[PDB]
Amino acid sequence: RKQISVRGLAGVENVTELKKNFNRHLHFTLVKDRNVATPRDYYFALAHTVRDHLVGRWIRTQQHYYEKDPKRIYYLSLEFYMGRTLQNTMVNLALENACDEATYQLGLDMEELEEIEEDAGLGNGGLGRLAACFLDSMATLGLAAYGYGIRYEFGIFNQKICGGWQMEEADDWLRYGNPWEKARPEFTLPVHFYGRVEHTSQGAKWVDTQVVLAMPYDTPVPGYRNNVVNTMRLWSAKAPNDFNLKDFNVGGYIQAVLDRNLAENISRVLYPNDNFFEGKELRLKQEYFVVAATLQDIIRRFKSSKFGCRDPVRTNFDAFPDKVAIQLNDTHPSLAIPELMRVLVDLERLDWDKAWEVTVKTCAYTNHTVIPEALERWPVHLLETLLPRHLQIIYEINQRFLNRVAAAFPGDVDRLRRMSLVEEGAVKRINMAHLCIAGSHAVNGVARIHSEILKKTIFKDFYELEPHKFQNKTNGITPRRWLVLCNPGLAEIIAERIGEEYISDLDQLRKLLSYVDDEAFIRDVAKVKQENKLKFAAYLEREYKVHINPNSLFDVQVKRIHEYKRQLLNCLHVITLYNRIKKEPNKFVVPRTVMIGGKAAPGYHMAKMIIKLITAIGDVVNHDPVVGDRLRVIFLENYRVSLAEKVIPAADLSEQISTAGTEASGTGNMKFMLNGALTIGTMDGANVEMAEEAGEENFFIFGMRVEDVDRLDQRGYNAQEYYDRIPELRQIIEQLSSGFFSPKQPDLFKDIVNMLMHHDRFKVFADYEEYVKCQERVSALYKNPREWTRMVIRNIATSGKFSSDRTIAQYAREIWGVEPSRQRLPAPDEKIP
């Protein structure tokens, strides 16, 4: 509708400078002219003009670290969920408004162009977005840090609903090019697979391996206004030229060339699984490929440091942990550990015992879940085929580890079979989480209950052996994408009262408590939320047609579709609402638009069945005339980072409904608290610290706490007891069973009825009473608007703890051994030396 905001300055020389460079790239880069360029060409000409302001800083940030030679952080992760990069690069560079002006002054709309950029979807959900929020905070806090991963050609599938069913399609995100990466084929590295170990004379050598080459592509990562631009280096697999061709004595020339994309398949696609584990060979190859190439880049930069000069010299790998820290994001890069040992013992010739002290002191592991099927336990026959030397290192690590255990707990022979990194069973497997705790100096959970559960349940044997290792670092979100850029309106009215230093010191939001009774602030906070609701209701109407009423409670659950996340308990509530107004049509109920969005992993039949229940409820509710506009259900197609930047500011109610003790943290819950939505949720993961921060009175907690879940499981969850005692619940089960929601095919949901009734791992019926109760308490508050906005002002003013600048300042300090900083690096300026 309008804006000016403090998206920086649009200064005279700079709007002019930009327009010129925009017209340059349209001509020289795009080789398009004004009468034939489309909005996409206009998008790339701006994308190149904005990366031009970034390269000078990138060049000097990288030479600056070469000169001062910090300890460098390597965040290894198999997922990095970046989303779009234009607006965020403008935010961090102070260019939002000058490019806005310049674009207006050239006849275009920035927002049109910004919507043309495709999302880099290299992540599934939470862990991958966490990696992306960390890179932002590591650059903003001036750390010499590098994100490393795989440059996947096809990120997470684009979801389409066809006839209410998920239909998945390839995310060919590079179809049109990527203006942000810089291929660096001169730095390609080999990564070896298969092979043998020959033991001769002095050590093992891994021989007759097949070679795949790792080609890197660097994406710049600019901090918020401090002239630090760090590097995300993503590897692409490339077939060699000789082996992937010469080995001869007939087998087709053309075939040998066509078979190269077989080795180049290691980076073809992101594995699409939220909280599960696929024991597939392609996957372990992707995991070894990023570990292998990354560790060669690490050692390379260490060998220069300044030791490649002196410092001491006589290759004292002794200082390797005082120059490198590698952060294992989950067990996906756990081969960082036998691979660092392999180079150090086999190739570099240190003794096992020096090389183990160097490995544990440089590695650290972040654990992201408790659910047992997410755990990676790779079968031994896979590792001995593919990586025979690393299996051999893992059996000697295992050996020496359990000799410490038995020395520490003598006679405790079941502990020994429980701590082992080798799981006997039909299929003997390697427990990768165990590897990680054994060869890392610090282990951490992503929220205070999650970290307490690890010590108390899942890794108690390991805590008793090395208590000092276990740590907690509650997750965070970046105030730059998740507030300044998806919600410029809410950021200006905060910046009007308290200024802008909160964008890199989010704890300042607390100074907003003073305005909880300021009627100018209550109306502005309330005007921003209604604005966002109108802009999203229009988006809905435009891009997807649907039309919803902007004057309802916008009830939204957006996250991957998993049973533990409980989209089914939300469904049970909307069917209740439906039925309470079918019995009393003429009772006023507060009207709500309830929006559920998220992706189902492709062969997870329950998740795909839950998307078909949600679109089935919307087919009834959205077409009943007695309901009118009072209730609508909307399934939010193709949830991804850029859609989250649209919906979360338009949210009034955030659904954070997991069975207590299953969500390790969640970070979507945080994004929704900085953007003026209220939380209804169980005491799970970080919802606990969030309510502790806003006060439980300012939060709508319901349900079973974890204690209660353990009592229910000692007792035995019988779901028939909830059916027998709750008539509103009896009735829903029977409407699902008789085809009410699937007329033409009545039995269609009996998979879901049989499950809820007989195999509910996540106790949906047990939290049902307390949850429709709690849901009556939020509707009661919504219809007294000024007391809703005051509860909202108490949530927003208490979001500070949940910034990734705090989480990363705590990894920096208590795990990596670096001090953060905000002192801006010298101004971008010229000087070619």
Next chain:
Amino acid sequence: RKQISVRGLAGVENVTELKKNFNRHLHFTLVKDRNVATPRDYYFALAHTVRDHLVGRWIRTQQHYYEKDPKRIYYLSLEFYMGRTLQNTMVNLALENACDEATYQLGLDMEELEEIEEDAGLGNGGLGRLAACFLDSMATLGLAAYGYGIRYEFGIFNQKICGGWQMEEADDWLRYGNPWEKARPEFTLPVHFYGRVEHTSQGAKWVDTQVVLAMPYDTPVPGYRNNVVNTMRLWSAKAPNDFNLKDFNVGGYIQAVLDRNLAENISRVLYPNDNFFEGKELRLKQEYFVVAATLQDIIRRFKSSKFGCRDPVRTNFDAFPDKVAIQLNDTHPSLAIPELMRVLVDLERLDWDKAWEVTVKTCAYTNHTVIPEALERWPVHLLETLLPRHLQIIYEINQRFLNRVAAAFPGDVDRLRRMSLVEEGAVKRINMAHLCIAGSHAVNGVARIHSEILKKTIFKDFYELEPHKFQNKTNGITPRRWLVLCNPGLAEIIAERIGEEYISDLDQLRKLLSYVDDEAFIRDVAKVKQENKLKFAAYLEREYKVHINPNSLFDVQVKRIHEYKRQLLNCLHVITLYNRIKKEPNKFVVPRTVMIGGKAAPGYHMAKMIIKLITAIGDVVNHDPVVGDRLRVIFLENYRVSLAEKVIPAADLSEQISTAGTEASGTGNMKFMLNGALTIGTMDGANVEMAEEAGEENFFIFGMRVEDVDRLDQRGYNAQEYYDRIPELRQIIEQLSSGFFSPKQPDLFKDIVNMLMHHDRFKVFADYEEYVKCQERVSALYKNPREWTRMVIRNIATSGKFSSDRTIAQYAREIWGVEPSRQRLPAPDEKIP
């Protein structure tokens, strides 16, 4: 050593302008700085700075044709052998010297950087290089012409000799990027495969096809100093997103994504075959893919022309031949013909008879060979699986064609089975050359004997039916790469006497005859050749170590290794030389370095065996002490366009030794005549017109003429008769048979002895006597240096006929119906309208 030349002007503002843009791209494009850039970064910064001068001209040449709307030429070819693009773009743009200066003034050497560029090897030999010389001449003659083909990821294999054997390896030419193409993914098109024909109500429809998408990449093609920059558009195969993913009911998500490079395999690799024919499905798919996508681009530009406005209107495809001409380079794009019919009949709804008159008037075919196994005769079961509608069009074309034949030659029933486009036999096949003659309005050979042979032998039935169709257009070479850029020294001393207008009017070289007796010109011509010999002898010593004597006759044969090209007859001569000085060690013989280079198709066992004989002769000769430096044999590794630009200026003797009547033209023979080498050759292909142009006295013709070859075949070639009568020949056969040239393994060459003796298709022994005779006559002339240079001045001064500007001005005028031009298009300048 030195140069200045007239490689254009290095003017004050321009050397400055260039240095600046070089430093810009190193920083902003390369994101490298001065202390860390390698010669490759320096190469790309210049490559981008030179394409910046090209885009303004390209943009305005393409909008200029949209405004005047010429008849446009489409040169469809499956091969385009471009070589490197930097120096040639500098030549044609007048930038050679300013960039030379600027680079010197920035501390680098241009020649170092220019050697870093990888050759675009999208061709096998002659036909592919012809396409590349034509594009240059079509732009220089200001024609609105477009080269169309496949953007192959892997061009022709890089050859390596290991132990004297060819070893082939992938040409991953895009490893480092290509600064010259511009991807245009917004213009992707579908190309359909497989399917069915349903006949309903009004016509056939091709239904249930699989879809592959064609992504184009445009390379600019600048004419020699006329501000026309035309377009080579090369298609890349891309899998669709929905079909290459959705078709469901289980078959793996990850698999569906990995299987996309199966459809993207259509442009993965160039088929590596010189003069043979592979009936492989991948190949017909590449042939349909370029026809399909090209014809959609053709029709698109025709539908705008100005008819998409009016001109008349009521879609009078009537004017389609007065606006389009498509040139079939060989039968590889022959499906241009049932595909143009298919769109016009099926999709566009014209009657068969209007659509056939429009097809023949727009298509024309260039025939490139006579050897029967080069002929494409695709088996019917392939075409009915893959392209069922086009087979159906080819059977109705066939039908109506033979009804004309039978009407014209009534009762002549064997003519009917000979002209048929459908070859009955065990495997019924379609004769694609026949398709081409039936649906083209003009057919041509590539040299006056080759064109006479078509009328007289291979297509006599077709000439008697439509005599008016057959034409000749002798091949040419471009004076810009093949003289101005590989031989700047020879071009300045010509330009010193006669000026520079000869570079686009090569017939002016005749004014050099006046200097055949000018002792200043004889010494300069002779100094340039000795310079080139020293620069190549150093190259040899550097890049490949070898060391040859620059004071010998440099005897060179460079071309693909085929039996008809007769590398074996040259080998028989060098073994003779060897043996004549083994019998008389102390006779002075004129010393020669004989260099044979060329690639063997991978499973052509004779060609691979001929490369092993040549490296085997060099192992003896090059290590005999009695020979001294008097004779050396050098196998020239990885012959390709950029190596041809090195060797051909260093050549004294050109070997053009094919059995008369087998080489259709040859164009290497021409390149060698403009660069001061003398030809020893048979009366074959264009060697006939070349000797007719220089006078037979100035040429060293030997051997059997085609008449004589027919008499020998009527009689019966018995090779034992030549063995019995020629002792020097008896002796070589026995040295090959007894392991003289393969000691450790004696029988190693008996494949080649058995062949020469019993299965010689190309009569090597019959031309042996006359050829060692003729070879004694060139050594006699070499040792009287001033009379060699005068014969050389008479060859160089008579090269004019062999320019592709003359060949293309004759296609323009007598086949396409366009007038050439040299009037430079307006100066590059700015103006964004």
